Amino acid sequence: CTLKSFTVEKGIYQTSNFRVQPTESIVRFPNITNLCPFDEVFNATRFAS
Amino acid sequence: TMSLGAENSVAYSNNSIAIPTNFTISVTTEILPVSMTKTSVDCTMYICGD
Numbered sequence: 751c752t753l754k755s756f757t758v759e760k761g762i763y764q765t766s767n768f769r770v771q772p773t774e775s776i777v778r779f780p781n782i783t784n785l786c787p788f789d790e791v792f793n794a795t796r797f798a799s
Numbered sequence: 800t801m802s803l804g805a806e807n808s809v810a811y812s813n814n815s816i817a818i819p820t821n822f823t824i825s826v827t828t829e830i831l832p833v834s835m836t837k838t839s840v841d842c843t844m845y846i847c848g849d
């Protein structure tokens with residue numbers, strides 16, 4: 751497939767690169783959880799000029 | 800201004816020759832590169848990583 755031929759001559763050929771694949775996904779985020787005050791900004795009665 | 804060499808005037812005349820009466824066995828070094836570092840680059844990993 752690499753040489754694009756069905757007949758391969760004698761020699762050494764670089765074909766691909768072996769790489770080990772990941773096994774599982776780990777997400778690390780800060781443990782602290784506080785509901786963010788988007789209500790104060792977006793639902794306010796009065797805005798500034 | 801760099802000097803090209805020491806100035807030597809050869810005593811040329813039409814009927815005189817200079818013949819060596821002795822010799823020096825001189826060993827000199829000549830350094831020649833032959834090969835380089837053989838490098839292979841993973842094109843996909845270099846451009847894209849993981």
Ligand SMILES: *[C@@H]1O[C@H](CO)[C@@H](O[C@@H]2O[C@H](CO)[C@@H](O)[C@H](O)[C@H]2NC(C)=O)[C@H](O)[C@H]1NC(C)=O
Nearest residue numbers: 806807808809810811812815816817818819820
């Ligand atoms: C051969 O003879 C010539 C002159 O007869 C020599 O040349 C002189 O060498 C002296 C020494 O350096 C210089 O100061 C002079 O100016 C030279 N003269 C000329 C006309 O060039 C030469 O050195 C002699 N060769 C040897 C091997 O003794």
Ligand SMILES: *[C@@H]1O[C@H](CO)[C@@H](O[C@@H]2O[C@H](CO)[C@@H](O)[C@H](O)[C@H]2NC(C)=O)[C@H](O)[C@H]1NC(C)=O
Nearest residue numbers: 816817818819820821822823824825826827828
């Ligand atoms: C040619 O040159 C060599 C040196 O390049 C001379 O050898 C020297 O000879 C003296 C006395 O004969 C010694 O004291 C030195 O130790 C020798 N030097 C070496 C390196 O061996 C030699 O005699 C010269 N020959 C002529 C005919 O002039």
Ligand SMILES: *[C@@H]1O[C@H](CO)[C@@H](O)[C@H](O)[C@H]1NC(C)=O
Nearest residue numbers: 788789790792793794795796
């Ligand atoms: C947004 O504001 C209105 C009155 O200004 C209030 O009735 C409503 O409950 C608020 N909603 C939130 C999600 O804070």
